[PDB]
């Protein structure tokens, strides 16, 4: 840790802080995630263990690179490539006239390439939200925060705690499915996609039931025809009101015919039929994809 100059604090977390730093010998600008080690009670946190072990298998231009792990006495530092801000702040900054559609298409294309790589390497992210997505001045966007990510060579058990902030959580999870699938990542990305287009969260639920019902009101209450098995799922109630699916032309006005088609496939109710990241990359929506550079307010 001797060759690093701390530049500024750029992030606060549960197990520790993230600093912008500079390698004094090479000049490389870096993000340092500091983890304080309670050496009486816990040892190395599960989040660090998963994020280090899975991330070092994931070398891809749309996944934030782990450059080094400096593991010592009573501190663990993760050294990452430095990016310039997260998508949430960029969305907020772009409120008085949106992210241009060519940049939205670029970002979704890159995010699906990052995800496809994850999934091909049996890694579930499980926490895709705009503040875990990092952007740079040259027009790149990358997946970050793999603390909740998991290997699925064996199917990953859902919990009753902890994760995917409610707004990006998939219906199967809300309805209490036993195992995660790669469909949950695709769902979250669909919500993020819509949120870029409309400048608002697609499903800003105040609670689990409220989250579910906002989805039902926009996409329609699912039945055994649309989603074989729904009615047998743990947290499904026959009391659920039956709403009608509304036009995507009114849910996402600015999107063209192709855009609506992709989004509907990403928000398909049945996880088995929800579009894969790979299949989404082959969608005609991306046939004219470019890589614009944004104007970040740094």
């Amino acid at each position: 840790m001797e060759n690093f100059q701390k530049v500024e604090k750029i992030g606060e977390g549960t197990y520790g802080v993230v600093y912008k730093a500079r390698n004094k010998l090479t000049g490389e600008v870096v993000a340092l995630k500091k983890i304080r080690l309670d050496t009486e009670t816990e040892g190395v946190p599960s989040t660090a263990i998963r994020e280090i072990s899975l991330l070092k298998e994931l070398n891809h231009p749309n996944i934030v690179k782990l450059l080094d792990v400096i593991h010592t006495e009573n501190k663990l530092y993760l050294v990452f490539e430095f990016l310039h801000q997260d998508l949430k702040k960029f969305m907020d900054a772009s409120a008085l006239t949106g992210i241009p559609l060519p940049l939205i298409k670029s970002y979704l294309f890159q995010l699906l390439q990052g995800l496809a790589f994850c999934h091909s390497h049996r890694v579930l992210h499980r926490d895709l939200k705009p503040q875990n997505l990092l952007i740079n001045t040259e027009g790149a966007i990358k997946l970050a925060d793999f603390g909740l990510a998991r290997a699925f060579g064996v199917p990953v058990r859902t919990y009753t705690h902890e994760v995917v902030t409610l707004w990006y959580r998939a219906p199967e999870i809300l309805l209490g499915c036993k195992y995660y699938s790669t469909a949950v990542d695709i769902w979250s990305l669909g919500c993020i996609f819509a949120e870029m287009v409309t400048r608002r969260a697609l499903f800003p639920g105040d609670s689990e039931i409220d989250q579910l019902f906002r989805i039902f009101r926009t996409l329609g209450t699912p039945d055994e025809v649309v989603w074989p098995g729904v009615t047998s799922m743990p947290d499904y109630k026959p009391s659920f009101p039956k709403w009608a699916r509304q036009d995507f032309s009114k849910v996402v006005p600015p999107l063209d015919e192709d855009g609506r088609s992709l989004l509907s496939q990403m928000l398909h109710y049945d996880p088995n039929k929800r579009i894969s990241a790979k299949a989404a990359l082959a969608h005609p929506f991306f046939q004219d994809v470019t890589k614009p550079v944004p104007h970040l307010r740094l």
Binding site: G43, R50, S53, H71
Partner: protein, 255 residues
């Protein structure tokens, strides 16, 4: 993506290999001592209701650690404890706290020792914890059951778990191959059927290619009641595993 994942698991299992002959190069410990350790880790898993995957990961970590580090017999259990702790953190939704792992060792080791060994194993394994296991390959194979049979799945898992106990001969087989032999042998024992054509296409393994591993596995299965280590048999006579460890093995495979 289930094809992409099998393909990727096949790639990674060749890279996570420990040294097959490491125990010879090891001055103070033996296969028997390893057998005792692994059997104990099975008990710990039952005591703390840990996933089967956690057990398989922990053993993979122990073999790789012992492939590059000399350990004295009095420290072998500290390696296993740290390995099980790391495997739980990687695989369990909520792992047992460190104090729990200190207590199953009957205070033979301290919290500090266990936490220091955790650091050392992470260093020696270079944080490469997401290893492919027999368990993961079995799980992928189970999706090619026409139709599903829980008694076959339980017996396949039982045989696969028995392979963890004896470094000789199972260290010299890939998890994908051990998994293939366990699946066939369980399938053959319960339903009389054989390694299906769908899995031949998926894995590229024929029944001919599985034969060497199959003959070892069959021999382990026949001698299971006489093995000095019994925690796996005891575990698999439970209702959750349909008492499959009390099933009679086939006298011949007719290969």
């Amino acid at each position: 993506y289930h094809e992409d994942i099998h393909t990727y698991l096949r790639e990674m299992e060749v890279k996570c290999k420990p040294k097959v002959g490491y125990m010879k190069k090891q001055p103070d410990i033996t296969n028997s001592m390893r057998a005792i350790l692994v059997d104990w880790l099975v008990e710990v898993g039952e005591e703390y209701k840990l996933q089967n995957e956690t057990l398989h990961l922990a053993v993979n970590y122990i073999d790789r650690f012992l492939s590059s580090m000399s350990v004295l017999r009095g420290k072998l259990q500290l390696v296993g404890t740290a390995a099980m702790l790391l495997a739980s953190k990687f695989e369990e939704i909520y792992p047992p706290e460190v104090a729990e792992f200190v207590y199953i060792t009957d205070d033979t080791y301290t919290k500090k020792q266990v936490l220091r060994m955790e650091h050392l194993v992470l260093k020696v394994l270079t944080f490469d914890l997401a290893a492919p296991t027999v368990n993961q390959f079995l799980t992928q194979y189970f999706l090619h059951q026409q139709p599903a049979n829980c008694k076959v799945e339980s017996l396949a898992m039982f045989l696969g778990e028995l392979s963890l106990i004896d470094a000789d001969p199972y260290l010299k087989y890939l998890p994908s191959v051990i998994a293939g032999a366990a699946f066939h042998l369980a399938l053959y024992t319960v339903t009389g059927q054989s390694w299906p054509e769908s899995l031949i296409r998926k894995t590229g393994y024929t029944l001919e290619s599985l034969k060497p591993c199959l003959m070892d596995l069959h021999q382990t299965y026949l001698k299971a009641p006489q093995h000095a280590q019994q925690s796996i048999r005891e575990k698999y006579k439970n209702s959750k595993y349909h008492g499959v460890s009390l099933l009679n093995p086939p006298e011949t495979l007719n290969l």
